[PDB]
Each structure stands twice: as structure tokens, then as C-alpha cells.
């Protein structure tokens, strides 16, 4: 009495994974070493986007298991390894090293945004919630073909040139009470930073405004009080030791590799006008794409300037007072900080149900 019927165009979807194509608006007439790579391996942006809000629906995202992060962390490794040619590059395989030597000119280097679209027959979901603690169902989703730009930047111990939340400082972590997994603060406003080299020796002073740092650092220590015993006075401390890379705030700017001794930023203790930092410009670094050491040419003549917004940071506990010590080092988990609100699914518009027919 009941017979199978079939419908085409039924709203179903399932999780999957594919290879996205990076899409961004390049120029192809410049020579900067970002627009070139962007115009040779991307697609002109979608002029008018597409968005559809859903209702009475929940889905469980998970920021520490995504796949998009891996494709991004491979694609920009390609970008780098094509862009910045080191004058001598070293790498063990192990240990049997293997040097190399090619051309080593000077180049411009300012990153641009890069979207991430999904091929025909798939979709990308979002979480418009503003309380997302990283995991668990998000009761406010919305579909989209592809996302907002993501300026791919590298820097340790302080995320820079990133995006930020809009209600309160949030604190996301893999598994608190494990002491060996980084966390990810995120400010509601940019504590700006003037950081530059004058016209004598290779040395840069990194100006950051006070009374906007401590004002934007009070919010943080309050948020830590909630997820903890709201007692056991906490403090901010220096680095702990190891390689030079992790014990500072290193990054690139205009083509050089700054190393600012941010020892005078994490020293306050919280019971219930300007600041400067002594940066250097090193010339033999430790690569992050692989294991090994690079080496570049001496710095350029003129003045070098670049300003950014500190929009987040990485910490680490210490297994009571429980002071915190900015560490980090690894570069994979500073893209989770702007890619947690996305998950890619697969459409399956074909279903069946029982009814009464011929």
C-alpha cells in the first residue's frame, strides 16, 4: 500500500573534503612578489557574493580538526618558497646536509588578502554566534560560496595584521588542564604599533603606546579569572628559553627580519606614555617551511617603516599563582585564529520516501 517515491533537489548535506581554489583580485602588472604569485595561481574574485541564512538549524563545528587549514599552510609555503630566494639555504635530511646557492636580489613584500572558494557541488558553512568556545554545536549557521580575505602573515608570540571579535575578549583552547597546548586570546580592538628603523646602524626601536596596552590588557586578566578559580593571583612573565625565534616577536617587514625583545611587555601582576622595544635585523634565521637555516643579504639603505595591529597572542601555562609566559613558536595554529568559523560540506540532492502512487 506504501510505495517508494523519489525527489530531486532535496536539502541534504554531508561532511566531505576536496581541494579548494584560492581566489583573490590580483593586478598582474606590478612586480611585488605577492601579486605575481597571486596572479599566476588564482582566479579573479567573485564580483557579487552569495549568502543564505538558515533557520531552526544547528551544526557542530570543530576548529582543531579542520582541513582547510592544511591546504592554506601548504599553499603559502609554496608562495614563500617561490618568493624569497635565500642566498644560501641549508637543510638536513638525516645528518647529511645539502647547501645550495642561487641569485639573491631584493624584492618588495607586503601581503594581500586571499579568499578560499569551494568547487561546484560543495558549500561552506559559517557560525554567526559570538560566544563560540571552539567546539560544540553552533545554533546560528549560514551558507556561502567563499569567505572574506585572509591576509597570510607570519609572526611569533603575537599575531599581527589579523581580524578580531566584536563583543568581548575571548579565550579559545584545545584542552585546558593539559599544560602543553597553546591558547589563543583575541582582542576587541587594535593596540597599534609604530615599529621602524631610522636612517643609523642596523637597529630598530618598536614604539607601542601605553595606557592603551594596559587598558586593553586588563580585559584579558578578567577573562582568565572566569575559566579559573577567580583567585590565585596571576602574572605575566618573560619567555622561558630556547631558540631565539620563540623568545621574541619575530616577523618580516619590507623584506627584513625584525627581532624585537618583547621582555618589557609581560611583567605586570594583577591582584583582585610611550614604550619602546630594542629590535634587531638578523641575517641567518631558522626556516619554518622545513628544518634548516637560511641566509640573506645585508639590509637596504633607506628608512623602513611598517605599522600593524596586535590582534591576539599565544600563551602557555606552567604546571598557587599560575603566571603566564608567552611562547608559541609553531606557525600552523595562527591560521586557526581566523578560520574557525568555516566548515566544508557536500551536497547530495537525491532522496527517497514512502507514499502512495501508481
Amino acid at each position: 500500500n506504501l510505495w517508494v517515491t523519489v525527489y530531486y533537489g532535496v536539502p541534504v548535506w554531508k561532511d566531505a573534503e576536496t581541494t579548494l581554489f584560492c581566489a583573490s583580485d590580483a593586478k598582474a602588472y606590478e612586480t611585488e612578489k605577492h601579486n605575481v604569485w597571486a596572479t599566476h595561481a588564482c582566479v579573479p574574485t567573485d564580483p557579487n557574493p552569495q549568502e543564505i541564512h538558515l533557520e531552526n538549524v544547528t551544526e557542530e563545528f570543530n576548529m582543531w580538526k579542520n582541513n582547510m587549514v592544511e591546504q592554506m599552510h601548504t599553499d603559502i609555503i609554496s608562495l614563500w618558497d617561490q618568493s624569497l630566494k635565500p642566498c644560501v639555504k641549508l637543510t638536513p635530511l638525516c645528518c647529511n646536509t645539502s647547501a645550495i646557492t642561487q641569485a639573491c636580489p631584493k624584492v618588495s613584500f607586503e601581503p594581500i588578502p586571499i579568499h578560499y572558494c569551494a568547487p561546484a557541488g560543495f558549500a561552506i558553512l559559517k557560525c554567526k554566534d559570538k560566544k563560540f568556545n571552539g567546539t560544540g554545536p553552533c545554533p546560528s549557521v549560514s551558507t556561502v560560496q567563499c569567505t572574506h580575505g585572509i591576509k597570510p602573515v607570519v609572526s611569533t608570540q603575537l599575531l599581527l595584521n589579523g581580524s578580531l571579535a566584536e563583543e568581548e575578549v575571548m579565550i579559545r583552547s584545545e584542552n585546558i588542564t593539559n599544560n602543553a597546548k597553546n591558547i589563543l586570546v583575541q582582542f576587541n580592538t587594535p593596540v597599534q604599533i609604530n615599529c621602524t628603523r631610522p636612517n643609523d646602524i642596523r637597529q630598530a626601536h618598536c614604539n607601542v603606546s601605553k595606557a592603551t596596552w594596559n587598558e586593553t590588557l586588563g580585559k584579558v586578566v578578567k577573562q582568565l579569572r572566569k575559566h579559573f578559580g577567580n583567585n590565585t593571583i596571576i602574572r605575566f612573565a618573560n619567555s622561558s628559553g630556547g631558540d631565539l625565534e620563540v623568545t621574541t616577536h619575530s616577523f618580516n617587514c619590507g623584506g627584513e627580519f625584525f627581532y624585537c625583545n618583547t621582555s618589557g611587555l609581560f611583567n605586570s601582576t594583577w591582584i583582585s606614555d610611550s614604550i619602546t622595544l630594542p629590535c634587531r635585523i638578523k641575517q641567518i634565521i631558522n626556516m619554518w617551511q622545513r628544518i634548516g637555516q637560511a641566509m640573506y643579504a645585508p639590509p637596504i639603505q633607506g628608512v623602513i617603516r611598517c605599522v600593524s595591529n596586535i590582534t591576539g597572542l599565544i600563551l602557555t601555562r606552567d604546571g598557587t599563582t599560575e603566571t603566564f609566559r608567552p611562547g608559541g613558536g609553531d606557525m600552523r595554529d595562527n591560521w586557526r585564529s581566523e578560520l574557525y568559523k568555516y566548515k566544508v560540506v557536500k551536497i547530495e540532492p537525491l532522496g527517497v520516501a514512502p507514499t502512495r502512487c501508481k
Partner: antibody
Amino acid sequence: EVQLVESGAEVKKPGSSVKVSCKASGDTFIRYSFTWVRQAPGQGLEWMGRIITILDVAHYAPHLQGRVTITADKSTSTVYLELRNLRSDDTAVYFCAGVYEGEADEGEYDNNGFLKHWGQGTLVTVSS
Amino acid sequence: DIVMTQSPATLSVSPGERATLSCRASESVSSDLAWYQQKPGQAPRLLIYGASTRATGVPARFSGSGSGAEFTLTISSLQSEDFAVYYCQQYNNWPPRYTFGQGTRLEIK
């Protein structure tokens, strides 16, 4: 400000090889590059090749490739040169040379080319 | 191939006077050149680097200049001990292939 006592005089045979020493002493070692240059009688100096200390990545001249090798050891602070397949004509006076390269150990390097500190040369001869 | 040529081949000038030297390059060596002073049987000495600077322990009567493919050095007041040979070598190309000059003879008149 390091003093580079080169090796003593030597007399060898055709086709052979040789290993020359250059003892550096006076300051920290791995802040210094090094270079070996040679001179034939009456003729100008001849750049042979360069070695970097903090990376141990040498290079060599085109028309002297293959039969020469430079090597240093950071424990004994000596720069060993080796040259393969000698002859009776190529024997000449070789020179040890160095230069200060910057605060190396903390990841800084200036990468200069010229030669400031010199030894006193070496005598290399092939005879019968 | 970058090549350096000596000019003049020899300069025999009297004391108390001024003497000048030049070195000719094949192509652009922008700002990479040095000048060495070779004594009889003694290790050479570094005087100039970067074509416009002076080393430590140098009498100011030495000076060099020029760019493009020609660089010139002059000595303004000879002394009875400043008679020696002089060379010029450049270090501009990378990977490292550093050519070396041929020299110049100098003696009392």
C-alpha cells in the same frame, strides 16, 4: 686581531696532494671568514676560493675546480687546505687570509669579500 | 667575464711629488673594490675598501674614487719607504668568483 701562523716551507712531487695549516689565535673563531690566495714568482696574486665559518659552505674558482678542497674544524681552530694532482709548474707561494664578519653566533653576518688580516705566506715547490 | 686591466703599466716618480693609479673594469662593479700594497717578500697590506674608505693605521695621503668600470687612487707625497707594488681586486659577483688585478711597478727615479 687574530694572528695566522701559516705552515712551514714544503717541497713535494708531481701529481701529489698537500694539506696546509693556518693556526688562528687571538679572538673568538667563528666570527671570522677565511680565504686562501697564492702568488707565483713575479706574477700577481691569484684568488683561489672562500670558506665561511658559521656555515661551512666553501666555493672555488672555475679554472681550479675539482682538485682542491678547503676545510676547517671549530675545535682546533685551524683551516686546512688540500689541493689534488699537483704539478711542477703550479708550485708557488700561497697565503692564508681572514676578515672579521660580525656578531655571528647571535645570527648576524655582514658577508664581506676583501681580506684584512694576513699571515706570512707559504713556500710550495716541486723539484727533482 | 669581468676583467680588470692595469693603467699605467709602470709609474716611476720622484719623491716629494704626487703619483696616481687607475684600474679599469669590464662592466659595472658599482661599489666593490679594494687596493693592496705588496712589499718585497712581505704579506700585502689592506688600504682601501669600498673604493672610498680607509683602513686602520693609514696615513691620510691615500685616497681612491671612481665608479662604473674605472677607479682611481693617488698618492700625494711619496716617502722613501712607500715604493712597492699595488693591486686592485673586485668582489661584486655572487656566487663568489672574485677576480684579481695584475699590479703596477713603482720605483725611485
